[PDB]
């Protein structure tokens, strides 16, 4: 319906860009998520983030991507109506921090995230803000990519896009080091971080500044050099004075993971964007041979 | 970053599917009571100059033209309002495509206060409503970009020339509205390649696109004429733009006399 046909049930989300309510259609009873966007305080019209989010979501019809159901555009207000999902992965991880997420469920979620992401990339969309709070789970075992406010249509080949992309902890090294070009690999990096986070119940690289983030990565994966990453010493923010740390053994990093899991994770956190595994290839990894769709305990 | 191989084919296939949906009506101008192809040409040529003033991407220009043709395909517009539609389209294309879109006040300024901020913003709303927020259109630009990958090693002069030819197609609705962006891109690429190196549309592209050099012919004949008559055309913003060394001054190159093809 319209403004008047929705009953607001509660504020369920706040973010950099949107005011989000759980609401119900008074006429059909359907429960939805309402993302409110003020054009007010807006003397520039419809925000580019909303313009990209809406236009890209309309092209992204997939089981593992949140559904945009309606757009209500008025003089002062812009409302995005989404299907409602039970909760985000962040809330689920916190509720699971004591016990842990069962490995079969971690595998199912990653498999589904890769399917959503590979769908995006195949439709020339970069997400650019993959983090647990932007991933939505339902009660039946599904997980979906949400929050396309930072998303972008990309060209082949790629152009220089926005430097300020991705929440810090999930930000890829090519971005931190200041490459002008970046691509699909930045989404894979984020997913790798999220994988490791599900397994260990902790953020993999919780930096508190750009250089702290970069060193946390170096301390874990080893300081990159021209051999593992040709060109790295030429990046705009690279400094020859960076400490040279050695790579840690992954059994020390993600103890609970078997050889296949460690293999896949290492490939998702490859330094060189050109060799970092793609969503599509990741889906073919032996790690997923036995994948099922378990229900989470909510 | 530099590598693009995994989703390359998927993206090309997807774009080929989008282009036959995000399509404007070939002869929609006959049904406009007050505006003509000549007015459209003047509008686009102006948008080229605007894009230069503000250092907007070529993609942004192609997108704006796409929006304009789709909007005019279903809305009657009086001549005195045509520039307002074009301004709103450029603003929207900028918001979609640019890192730094110019602000609305700036858009009002380059029309020389012909319209108010309120009008531009209200028009933005109307265009969004008429296009149903479907802004992620495929353009001649996107197809060229992919085609360029078949050039090894890369040839910057060929790329600038192809872009130049692609941009000239935007000015004249007759006859270019009747060709899909992928086909225009194909004829442009072949024509640029041929002019600069004497080489022809590659079999690898023919395979990928399904277009043989034969299927390019009709469009290629038109594009060749357009190229030959460019110095004569009433609209000159594109030639001026591509005289710059930024684009290897390709608009100063002489077209080939014949194609023998």
């Amino acid at each position: 319906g319209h403004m008047e046909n929705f009953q607001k049930v509660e504020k369920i989300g706040e973010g950099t860009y949107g005011v989000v309510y759980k609401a119900r259609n008074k006429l059909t009873g359907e429960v939805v998520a309402l993302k409110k966007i003020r054009l007010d305080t807006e003397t520039e019209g419809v925000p580019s983030t909303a313009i990209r989010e809406i236009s890209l979501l309309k092209e992204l019809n997939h089981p593992n991507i949140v559904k945009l159901l309606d757009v209500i555009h008025t003089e002062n207000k812009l409302y995005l109506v989404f299907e409602f999902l039970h909760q985000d992965l962040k809330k689920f991880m916190d509720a699971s921090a004591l016990t842990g997420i069962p490995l079969p469920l971690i595998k199912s979620y990653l498999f589904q995230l890769l399917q959503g992401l590979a769908f995006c990339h195949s439709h020339r969309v970069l997400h650019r803000d993959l983090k647990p709070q932007n991933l939505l789970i339902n009660t039946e075992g599904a997980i979906k990519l949400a929050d396309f406010g930072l998303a972008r249509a990309f060209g082949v080949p790629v152009r220089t896009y926005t430097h300020e992309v991705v929440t810090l902890w999930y930000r890829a090294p090519e971005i931190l080091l200041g490459c002008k070009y970046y691509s699909t690999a930045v989404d894979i990096w984020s997913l790798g971080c999220i994988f490791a986070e599900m397994v260990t119940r902790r953020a993999l690289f919780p930096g508190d500044s750009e250089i702290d983030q970069l060193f946390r990565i170096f301390r874990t994966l080893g300081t990159p050099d021209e051999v593992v990453w040709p060109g790295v010493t030429s990046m705009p923010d690279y400094k020859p004075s960076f400490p040279k740390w050695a790579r840690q053994d992954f059994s020390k990093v993600v103890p609970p993971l078997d050889e296949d899991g460690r293999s896949l994770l290492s490939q998702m956190l490859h330094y060189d964007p050109n060799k970092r595994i793609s969503a599509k290839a990741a889906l073919a990894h032996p790690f997923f041979q036995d994948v099922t769709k378990p229900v989470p305990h909510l | 970053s530099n590598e693009v191989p995994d989703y390359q084919e998927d993206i090309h296939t997807y774009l080929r599917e989008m282009e036959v949906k995000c399509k404007p009506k070939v002869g929609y101008m006959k049904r406009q009571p007050d505006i003509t192809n000549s007015m459209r040409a003047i509008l686009v040529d102006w948008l080229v100059e605007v894009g230069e003033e503000y250092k907007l991407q070529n993609e942004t220009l192609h997108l704006a033209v796409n929006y304009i043709d789709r909007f005019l395909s279903s809305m009657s517009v009086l001549r005195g309002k045509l520039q307002l539609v074009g301004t709103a389209a450029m603003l929207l294309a900028s918001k979609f495509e640019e890192i730094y879109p110019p602000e609305v006040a700036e858009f009002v300024y380059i029309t020389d206060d012909t319209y108010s901020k309120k009008q531009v913003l209200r028009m933005e709303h109307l265009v969004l409503k008429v296009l149903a927020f479907d802004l992620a259109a495929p353009t001649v630009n996107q197809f060229l970009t992919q085609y360029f990958l078949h050039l090894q090693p890369a040839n910057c002069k060929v790329e600038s020339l192809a872009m130049f030819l692609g941009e000239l197609s935007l000015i004249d609705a007759d006859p270019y509205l009747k060709y899909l962006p992928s086909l225009i891109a194909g004829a442009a690429f072949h024509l640029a390649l041929y002019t600069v190196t004497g080489q022809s549309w590659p079999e690898s592209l023919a395979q990928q696109t399904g277009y043989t050099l034969e299927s390019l012919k009709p469009c290629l004949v038109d594009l060749h004429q357009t190229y030959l008559k460019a110095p004569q055309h009433a609209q000159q913003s594109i030639r001026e733009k591509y005289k710059h060394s930024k684009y290897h001054s390709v608009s100063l190159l002489n077209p080939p006399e014949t194609l023998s093809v």
Partner: peptide
């Protein structure tokens, strides 16, 4: 951290 914002241009 929060989602990052585009640096101001000029």
């Amino acid at each position: 951290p929060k989602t990052p914002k585009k640096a101001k241009k000029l």
